[PDB]
Design a protein around this ligand. Structure first.
Ligand SMILES: Nc1ncnc2c1ncn2[C@@H]1O[C@H](COP(=O)(O)OP(=O)(O)NP(=O)(O)O)[C@@H](O)[C@H]1O
Ligand SMILES: Nc1ncnc2c1ncn2[C@@H]1O[C@H](COP(=O)(O)OP(=O)(O)NP(=O)(O)O)[C@@H](O)[C@H]1O
Ligand SMILES: [Mg+2]
Ligand SMILES: [Mg+2]
Ligand code: NA
Ligand code: NA
Lengths: 658, 658
DNA sequence: ACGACCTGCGAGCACTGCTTTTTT
DNA sequence: CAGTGCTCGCAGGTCGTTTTTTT
């Protein structure tokens, strides 16, 4: 449509980035400087002005929510936004592998494991190894290796003779045996979503070429929190036409603990020596006051690229800090002030509370509840992570794929029905010699070489299952989930122990209703049940299917509660950062890691601060409760860093020193 | 109504007996001589001629069937038969005790034990005693003692130092402890029906006097097979007005094995020296031929009152014997011959088959079934004795009487439901210290001493029971038995194991239909369900509630199959006596007792023979199978006794001597 | 606080012997 | 046929570890 007018909506530098077009380009700019805004315009300009087809554009965001929100804002500038490919790296790996996984041994209908699934496999494999040792420790090494794009052999030659507390080679062994067992189940994990796609593109160059036709102009936001495997994925993708534009801010890199590699963004002009580089200097988000506090804070980190971050707004309402006697007084001080400011005109949805750890939510929730301030909890106890839901989702996995063993393992027991704690072991070894088909072991229980005591109990389960499978061979997702819930015998259990079980079956109802809202959605026209489970498996804390599911019964236009980490990318007129304490911000872990630990936490704190547009209120306590015990608390060292740049305050409005 | 005409319907001697009136009278006559006929006429004559009120007459028969049949025949002769009191001794014991048992500590709603109930009590009591030994051996000593009218102390002074194989004093102890336990349950047994009534009449002379107004003219049939307890009951009853007429034949005394005392009848005039004695000399039942065989047979017994038994009919068809190679050939020979005679004109219901033991019925049944000759089995597997029935009747006992422990014990685990085997025990001692009520223990399980690990299971049973008790507090027996069968969970068990279970639930349906037919009867107008259980408890082999229930689906006008014992009193134009073998008739038991054993068996055989009116066919085998093995068979010694008086015969018509 | 471990109870399934003398 | 013995399934209890952050 000739595009949106750049120089109308952007400053000249933003506008020249948005006008970039072909070849590698790197956009590097401090917080609140309009990196994401420039991205949105760039996408509309490629289409409007350079006549790029939407179905040739890929934009990779940190969360699907962030991608939905970009897409929409792009539709306001230019037609055809519906056709843009926009998602996380992991969501793209699903889409690529679902389409092309058969070129590298992934049979169609492969299953995507969750963390509980990974432990079934681990416990199963670790027995014979020189590895006491907790299955989850092993799981942590494997995830991290995959983020690093390491094979087991690679891990054998890794730097440290000890990983967590394990011998390097025992760890590699574990990983290696987990790998065989996981492939024997036609299954893959979260990190495989990235590593397998990379393997696909290297092994099958004609496949890379086909995908490059849809990913001809590549955009990647949050490039600072990219890992080696995502790095390598992006390289392969761009390798042909080299239309790669990345955007990020090294001061806001807060995922090293999980694999993020800040050198991806700092080496970009080395890896693409023909890149254009655009640097935004002006923050548009924040009051000049919160900004000065931000800049003086981040100047304490060392080895950082010094970049200009200059204010455009005036120095607004001053920044404040409050130390409460108690975390409970913190509670009340937050809860009280929400009102005052509401009373003065700011809507609930323009205010947020940020905390270092999810444990700190509980007290805050109750403090707003008491005063009935509506609350919206992001990233709390995940709804697709509850036992009830995964149990039903397991029944669903097993129905589509009768050869899925870890699914069986999880629900053969619940409800109880002649579960062979002894018997299952026997069906398990029986299956391996015959071949790993465990569900078939149950059907062949009465007829073949048998397990004596409860042969029939197996058969009945085999028949219960085929009825589900026949009900999945066609017959609708939301109602198929009713089929499973009813006939499995799951509901009548929860009703007969319906005390906390009513709480549990109340959630099972939501599942059907989610499966329903999803079915009746725009993008899911003719969507399979497999498709539903795919989406449910890939949700971020900030995604709709999660926030709605978990805040059901809450109004929108509520106060938002989340971690400092989930705040990445967002912005609010009013921000409360709570628990600014040595031991929390920075965490004890980061303290124990030395300067490089502290520097990560400082970035985290810097993110928190630069979330606020009009007012920032930080608080701390002198005492706080851990799991059952109360200990004295100290201010964060980070407050020392920004002394002189905020006012200390008592429960009421006014001045205190410190 | 002026009565029936005696001299029209009876010979002069019979008529003068039928005309007796006041004071003791003894009628003593051989088989087929019209003792029972005279009794029937005498009853009508007391009413018609002497103006005795029916409600003043008592006639004690050996079975309720025999009493129904007398009553009816009396109704043809005189109005007011409906009001006569006619029954067995044991049935009269129930009526007397139900009315007056509270005068001797029997609280209303006392329960009548069956043989399974007795064993519950036995096993419970014999633990501590110098008694290995089977609970049923003890049970047999107790029953015998009661028939003798012995107390435990009496048994301590009894003749033999060994009873069965027990020391005399351990047996008396057993009996003595059984007694306490049985009374602690407000319960009584079958023999108590006679001994407690006797105790009632001795302890409470005003009660005897009230009953004597209904039993003013007493009649007793089969007086030869009365035991001492019955002997003493009759004496008490007659002690005031002394209008006692007894009828019997010592040649047909066949119950010594159970207590019968032949001296009751032989001493009647020592006991009533002012008695009149009537003796019938003429048999009216039998062909002169079967009669000569009977007489020559009985003449072998010694020390018997030698009385005239002269024929009135002509020497009809000759009596025959057949030896068959097999019991199977016996089967076929009986089966084949039933038809011949059927073909010649005899109806099925004019023919019967008599065997020493109930085991012999199986082969016979099948032989008639093969040739589809309709069969009616008397005294086979008792219908009110099957497990399913006593289970439901136990539920019913418990509903009426929540304090019945034996009932509880039997069904607390039918169906299963936290049948605390260990819990029961813990439930049992709980109740002992607090007090007998075991059902309360189950209700008090959540509360109090806390029978744990399944507390609720007990409570739910206590609740299931109150619902039955509430449903027995009012409502209909036939539909209350539905209530029990449904809600107990009994039916859905038998349906879920409905294989031989369908055979078992088919029977449960008959129960409701019996319960119903009984309700809709003439005498049970406004009948309690307690009343129903009373009647079911007191059936003889020959009684309607039993034969109908056990031959359901069979036509009437069928061939009758029963033991020689159950033939007492009856008559048939055609009689087959099978298995006339040494070891059977006489039994090994009788053989081992010496001449007094042989003499009892000879009486038994004499009864069999004098059942036949027109034709008697006896058979024996050379081989026979017991339970597994097959052994050689030998003719009965009794055939030697009657040689010259029957024809030996081939499977066809005529002679094969031997 | 959370599951991953233990003690003990219920019950189903099999192994094993006189069932058969007669029954109010 | 029943009375008895062996082994298996499942609950109601106990204990130590929880989280640092999460695509
Ligand atoms: N040229 C501009 N004119 C007006 N508002 C702007 C301009 N550039 C950025 N903004 C606003 O500044 C705020 C932050 O922009 P955003 O594009 O979210 O910055 P970012 O660099 O992408 N923020 P962060 O991801 O947290 O480092 C938004 O509310 C934008 O609307
Ligand atoms: N005076 C009679 N006239 C005709 N038939 C008679 C006469 N007396 C007896 N009977 C018949 O003979 C058969 C036997 O009579 P019953 O009154 O049954 O004898 P009982 O002495 O009571 N028999 P039992 O009990 O087996 O020793 C019946 O069929 C009677 O009808
Ligand atoms: Mg941004
Ligand atoms: Mg008679
Ligand atoms: Na595209
Ligand atoms: Na009477």
């Amino acid at each position: 449509s000739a595009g949106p007018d750049l120089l109308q909506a952007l400053n000249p530098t933003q506008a020249q980035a948005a006008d970039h077009f072909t070849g590698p380009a790197l956009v590097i700019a401090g917080a609140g400087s309009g990196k994401t805004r420039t991205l949105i315009y760039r996408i509309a300009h490629l289409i409007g002005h350079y006549g790029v087809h939407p179905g040739e554009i890929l934009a990779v965001t940190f969360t699907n929510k962030a991608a939905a929100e970009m897409r929409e804002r792009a539709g306001h500038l230019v037609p055809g936004a519906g056709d843009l490919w926009m998602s996380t790296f992991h969501s793209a790996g699903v889409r690529i592998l679902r389409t092309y996984g058969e070129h590298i041994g992934l049979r169609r209908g492969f299953v995507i494991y969750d963390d509980d699934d990974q432990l079934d496999i681990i416990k199963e494999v670790m027995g014979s190894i020189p590895g006491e040792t907790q299955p989850r420790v092993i799981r942590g090494i494997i995830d991290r290796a995959k983020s690093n794009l390491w094979t087991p052999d690679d891990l054998d030659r890794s730097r440290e003779p000890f990983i967590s507390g394990l011998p390097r080679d025992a760890a590699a062994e574990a990983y290696r045996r987990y790998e065989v067992r996981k492939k024997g189940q036609n299954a893959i994990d979260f990190g495989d979503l990235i590593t397998e796609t990379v393997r696909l593109f290297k092994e099958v160059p004609g496949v890379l070429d086909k995908v490059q036709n849809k990913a001809k102009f590549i955009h990647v936001d949050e490039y600072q929190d990219t890992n080696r495997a995502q790095y390598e994925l992006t390289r392969l993708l761009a390798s042909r036409d080299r239309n790669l534009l990345v955007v990020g801010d090294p001061d806001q890199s807060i995922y090293k603990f999980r694999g993020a590699d800040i050198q991806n963004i700092l080496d970009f002009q080395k890896d693409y020596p023909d890149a254009k580089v655009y640097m935004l200097e002006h923050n548009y988000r924040s009051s000049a006051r919160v900004l000065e506090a931000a800049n003086k804070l981040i100047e304490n980190n060392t080895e950082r690229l010094d970049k200009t971050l200059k204010p455009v707004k005036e120095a607004g309402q001053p920044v404040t800090f409050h130390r409460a006697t108690d975390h409970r007084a913190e509670g009340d001080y937050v809860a009280d002030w929400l009102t005052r400011l509401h009373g003065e005109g700011r809507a609930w949805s323009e205010m947020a509370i940020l905390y270092r750890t999810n444990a700190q939510s509980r007290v805050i929730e109750e403090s707003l509840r008491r005063v009935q301030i509506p609350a919206r909890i992001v990233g709390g106890v995940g709804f697709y992570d509850r036992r009830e839901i995964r149990d039903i989702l397991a029944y669903a996995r097993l129905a589509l794929n009768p050869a899925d063993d870890v699914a069986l393992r999880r629900i053969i027991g619940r409800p109880r029905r002649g579960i062979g704690d002894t018997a299952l072991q026997k069906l398990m070894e029986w299956a391996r010699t015959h071949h790993t088909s465990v569900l078939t072991a149950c059907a062949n229980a009465a007829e073949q070489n048998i397990l004596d005591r409860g042969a029939h109990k197996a058969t009945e389960f085999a028949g219960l299952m085929e009825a589900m499978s026949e009900a999945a061979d066609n017959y609708e997702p939301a109602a198929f989930l009713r089929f499973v819930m009813e006939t499995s015998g799951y509901l009548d259990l929860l009703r007969q122990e319906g005390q906390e079980g009513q709480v549990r079956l109340e959630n099972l109802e939501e599942l059907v209703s989610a499966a329903e809202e999803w079915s009746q959605d725009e993008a899911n026209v003719g969507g399979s049940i497999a498709d539903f489970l795919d989406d449910a498996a890939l949700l971020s804390s900030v995604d709709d299917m999660r926030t709605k599911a978990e805040n059901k019964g809450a109004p929108e236009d509520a106060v938002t509660l989340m971690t400092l980490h989930n705040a990445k990318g967002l912005e609010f007129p009013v921000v409360f950062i709570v628990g600014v304490e040595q031991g929390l911000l920075p965490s004890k872990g980061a303290i124990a890691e030395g300067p490089s630990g502290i520097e990560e936490e400082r970035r985290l704190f810097y993110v928190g601060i630069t979330r606020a547009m009009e007012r920032l209120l930080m608080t701390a306590a002198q005492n706080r409760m851990q799991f059952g015990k109360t200990n004295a608390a100290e201010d964060s060292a980070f407050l020392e860093d920004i002394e002189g740049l905020f006012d200390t305050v008592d429960p009421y409005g006014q001045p205190i020193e410190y």
